[PDB]
RNA sequence: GGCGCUGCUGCAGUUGAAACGCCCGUAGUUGGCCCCCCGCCGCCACGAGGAAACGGGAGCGCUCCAGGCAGGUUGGA
RNA sequence: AUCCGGUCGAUCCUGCCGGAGCGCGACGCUCUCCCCAAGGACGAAGCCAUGCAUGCCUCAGGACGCGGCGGACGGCUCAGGACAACGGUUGCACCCCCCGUGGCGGUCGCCGGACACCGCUGGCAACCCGGCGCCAAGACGUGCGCGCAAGGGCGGGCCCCGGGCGAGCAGCGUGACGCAGCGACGGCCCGCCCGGGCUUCCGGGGCAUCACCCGGUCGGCGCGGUCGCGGCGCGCCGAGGGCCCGACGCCUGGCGGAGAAUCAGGGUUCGACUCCGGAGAGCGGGCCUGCGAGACGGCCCGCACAUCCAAGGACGGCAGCAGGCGCGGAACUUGCCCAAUGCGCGGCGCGCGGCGGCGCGACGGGGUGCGCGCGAGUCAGGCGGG
């Protein structure tokens, strides 16, 4: 890391995101409808009592492969052990793209992938599709029709082996087409 | 099955062993050791099948009981011991010393070497890792382990090892323009110079080399062995890693019965 | 399997019994086999089991196939053990020297 | 298994599709007359051995004159066809292979060679003399009427030194 | 016996799937320890060797007040809260993550320093401290934990409010 | 296989067997012409990587042959 | 790259019926010589008499016995199972692994007693066992030693980005627990190797007189269990998940591939059996020992069948090699040998496999003459062969 930190003079003020995260943590403590207190495993919970600010209050990482961390994950207040940026999982294996078929589950979506199958006797093709279940971190929000890029992780449920890592929005009320990519 | 395999059918043996499909249901199964099953040769297949010092299995055993064979300076009394690439093969009573390399058709050949050369070995650095109480180790293509290596040695370099102390005296860095030889695939056995290194994030890194006649070829980074710095540190067969085409090979074959 | 014909009842066709605290006890059978362990021949003969001359190769046995005493500390066996210890120290000494060399090397680098 | 399960075997002749055609029925017996042929199978074999060398050439002729497959296999085919004497030296073109007939194959049989050099008065006497171990090829006694003689080995066809006709 | 093989589940479309083999040894499961509070640890042979310790009837643990870093060995007094089921609290079953009351004696030597949480010093002034188990007693035979603080402490104090 | 009597190449539907009584219409299939020198598919070519036996195929007279991998510096491309 | 006979009083068509070729089995008739070579698979995974198919090497003349390594590989079969299995292609930053080959080796004065073989006595129809007693170890048990096995609390940066990565991964320090493993002939531990477990993408039978299906079913939270991830299991929360691009259900005289039969090109049909993978050992289940088995030439139980018996009991698994019964149109010797190719222990073992026997399933070569010499047989010696 050859270069070192150019000089803005509003940095320490702009770290008011510390009180932001702190009061979000203290709001989670008051929602007595919950049964478990949710917290990241990478973070002490004694760093919140301190005032010198010297220690970070939220954990995040980079996933590699030229995919950059969204700022909504860096400055969010949610808890997700299955989020690839702020949870306890990793991305490795195949990386694919598809379209959102359904977003009706809890932090889970269905993805529709399209492809062609050649039949040699008839010298022609047929159009085919498959459905893939994927995990949706709160740092993204999607609707049906949007393009997504998903990447492989370890097994996460009976049907899920992938995680949403990029979103390309698609306007509502547009003609739905084959769109293989 | 319910456990490990101990047999190996003759039709299932590796194709570069040049085993013939009659004269046996079974083939020797190499014992675990310094080399893997696919990229090796059982020692018996050299003494009986190739050099005819023995003529059967039973009398191939008695040569290895009285310890007439040294591999890398040690007598191996095991007929299916896996010998492989760069192993030193020395039979004293006949005064024959060989180095085990590949020919231009992906098969093992023995190259005669001098007594001033059989005291060292070239190994490929496969990995660097922290062992017990956090100490550094390096592992080679021979299943060899060295603690406290000099910090310059990095993965894909090659090291030179004296064959009595088992320590390092020299190392060659993996770079552009280094002399190299391919150890597997379908360009196995031929020798060239590196002229490209293309990394692909997540996937295999490919190497482009060029022969001494200028023919260019490609393979994966897991198959390129450095043999020196613009000059091979060892001796190589007479063909020197140049592969003919089928027509020139045919004319050389026509010329042998001629 | 099947077991236990009785806690002794009428069924049994056989019983096994031992005599305590004494037709009358007359015969005394000899012990066919003699002590074999090295200590087994020092408790018999009252010898101490702690000295630097424990050899004990008295050969009598009253010519009674069985002797070949076990657990005897000879001279060569003593040398063997001492040699193994003297090499188990050399390993540690050379290992600590190599560790020191590597630490100094990284210091220079 | 046993080792014998791995041995190969193959049929070496093709029977015709219409058996009862008159013109080839008598054309097929003029051939049994000019050569001491035992039965129709020895004709079938011949045609089968033609039908392969005809299939190769037509595969290469569809190709281009500078491809390596042509340069390699056509040269092999011509070099094999010149040694057996099925084709002669002056025709060293791959297109000269297509106009070949069975009679060219039948003319290099040992039974035919010994007739040509007049060791035997006819072809039937030649077959009888072959069966009697009376003839050697290059000092080697050959018992097979159907033997195929290479042009290298046609200078050296004689009566065997060990014989009752010596 | 008990198996965690997936061959007995329906597919994702709900369809019944067939059986193509009998039970394999490598897919077995065992029964749980149900470790009781207030000392036995059994040994279990596993695949390849690899002894597992399985605790029944543990009493003590080693606990850490992380913020000031005061680590002692203390006696676990009572399981007071559990996220999964209130049945696991009624029986004082020791599992990972349950909230317990531990003995205040070993930490009374920490009553002097100020600038130390009064939400921990006032806990110490009484008879017990609220703490959380952090180990798996059925897999390693041990029950250690940390002392609660921050918003977590308040969340569980309201969960155990005298209401 | 004959068989273009299963028809993608390549059948038949006025009268021999065969065009729904007709109109609307979703899924599906299909869709004029135009900018070239960017991206993403398809597509064409060349590579890398993984098994032999079988199937092709270079060389070799088990006396020929179905075979086999031989052999007289070699070879199993 | 081919057609031909049959509709009429005669004629041109459409259209089927029949003939002509190759392969696989069964039946009939017939057969001189030599080489190669399949051989109880075909809705009976029906039942089995008899013999053989697994042994080889620390402590005393030798056996015997103890201890050790192997018996989870090799051989047989195709019953089950249709988003399985299987084929190509990925991953484990969610894993386990004997032997072998490199490393590494720091741990808060020579101990004890007893078991088998064996002696002396017994029970029982036979299967199988009892009692008392002298005796060893490269067997146990306890251990002499420079503290360090598992797990746990803190030690990260608050645009966005070497020990080692594409990826904050792996080590180390420091407070607490704990006291494991290796030490009575020095090895716990670490890398590789082969092997396994799961896992990504694509391919992966027929029927619509089977159009709607599923309810641990689809997702979330927390624990447990596992070698390990995972609705794998359990508690709680939500209403999801699949479908005419054919879901679900039913049927199959359904093992998959590498391949095979046919033949201009495009295709059609079959994948019992040689190699690779899977599954089973009369049918359900359960398990111990081990690195590795849900093992059947291991054990336990239920069921259906048989075996010996003094009537009390004991006892079995040929879809191993021969052989037999039954069934069917349909398929061989109750041979010799570890000499070869290989495997376990090192010298043996081995119905793996090899060699003969029966064998017109099928392949290849040569005869029953030529104008006058041969082969088929006969008897001897070679060569070959355990
Ligand atoms: K989070
Ligand atoms: K596509
Ligand atoms: K496809
Ligand atoms: K389509
Ligand atoms: K789930
Ligand atoms: K699930
Ligand atoms: K479409
Ligand atoms: K199997
Ligand atoms: K195993
Ligand atoms: K095994
Ligand atoms: K084989
Ligand atoms: K073979
Ligand atoms: K075989
Ligand atoms: K072996
Ligand atoms: K089980
Ligand atoms: K198992
Ligand atoms: K047809
Ligand atoms: K056709
Ligand atoms: K046609
Ligand atoms: K038409
Ligand atoms: K009609
Ligand atoms: K009609
Ligand atoms: K009609
Ligand atoms: K119509
Ligand atoms: K219609
Ligand atoms: K209409
Ligand atoms: K319309
Ligand atoms: K319309
Ligand atoms: K439409
Ligand atoms: K459409
Ligand atoms: K259409
Ligand atoms: K379309
Ligand atoms: K149109
Ligand atoms: K393409
Ligand atoms: K192979
Ligand atoms: K050479
Ligand atoms: K045709
Ligand atoms: K007619
Ligand atoms: K008419
Ligand atoms: K007609
Ligand atoms: K049968
Ligand atoms: K059967
Ligand atoms: K049938
Ligand atoms: K049949
Ligand atoms: K049967
Ligand atoms: K074992
Ligand atoms: K066993
Ligand atoms: K059989
Ligand atoms: K089956
Ligand atoms: K093993
Ligand atoms: K998978
Ligand atoms: K998959
Ligand atoms: K898969
Ligand atoms: K698929
Ligand atoms: K249907
Ligand atoms: K439920
Ligand atoms: K769960
Ligand atoms: K549940
Ligand atoms: K529910
Ligand atoms: K259907
Ligand atoms: K069947
Ligand atoms: K065709
Ligand atoms: K077709
Ligand atoms: K075709
Ligand atoms: K056709
Ligand atoms: K068969
Ligand atoms: K099979
Ligand atoms: K098979
Ligand atoms: K096989
Ligand atoms: K196999
Ligand atoms: K297998
Ligand atoms: K099998
Ligand atoms: K199985
Ligand atoms: K079964
Ligand atoms: K059974
Ligand atoms: K069963
Ligand atoms: K059973
Ligand atoms: K069973
Ligand atoms: K296993
Ligand atoms: K079981
Ligand atoms: K079972
Ligand atoms: K039997
Ligand atoms: K069967
Ligand atoms: K037999
Ligand atoms: K019958
Ligand atoms: K009958
Ligand atoms: K043998
Ligand atoms: K073994
Ligand atoms: K046999
Ligand atoms: K004669
Ligand atoms: K004779
Ligand atoms: Mg097996
Ligand atoms: Mg089973
Ligand atoms: Mg209560
Ligand atoms: Mg047709
Ligand atoms: Mg509900
Ligand atoms: Mg198949
Ligand atoms: Mg098959
Ligand atoms: Mg069979
Ligand atoms: Mg078995
Ligand atoms: Mg069983
Ligand atoms: Mg019958
Ligand atoms: Mg012949």
Numbering used by the authors:
A (entry chain L): 20 to 200
B (entry chain E): 2 to 259
C (entry chain G): 101 to 122, 129 to 170, 186 to 187, 189 to 231
D (entry chain J): 2 to 167
E (entry chain I): 2 to 39, 51 to 175
Authors' description from the paper:
Multibody refinement resulted in a slightly improved density map of 2.69 and 2.85 Å for the LSU and the SSU, respectively. Since the comparison between the GL rRNA and human rRNA structures is most relevant for future drug development efforts, we focus on their specific structural differences. Thus, the comparison shows that many rRNA ESs present in typical eukaryotic SSUs, which are located within the foot and head regions in the orientations shown in Figure 2, are absent in the GL ribosome. In the SSU, rRNA helices h6, h16, h17, h40, h41 and h44 are shorter than those of the human counterparts, whereas helices h9, h10, h21 and h39 are absent. Furthermore, the GL SSU lacks the human ES3–ES6 and its eS8 protein is truncated compared with the human counterpart, where eS8 interacts with the ES3–ES6, which are thought to be late evolutionary extension loops. Conversely, the GL SSU rProtein uS17 N-terminus is extended compared with the human uS17, perhaps because the human uS17 interacts with ES6, which is missing in the GL SSU. Notably an elongated density located at the inter-subunits fits very well with the structure of eL41 from the human ribosome. The cryo-EM structure shows that this protein is shorter than the annotated one and its start codon for translation may be annotated as eL41, which is part of the B3 and eB14 inter-subunit bridges. Superposition of the GL decoding center on the human and the L. donovani counterparts shows the structural similarity of the PAR binding site.
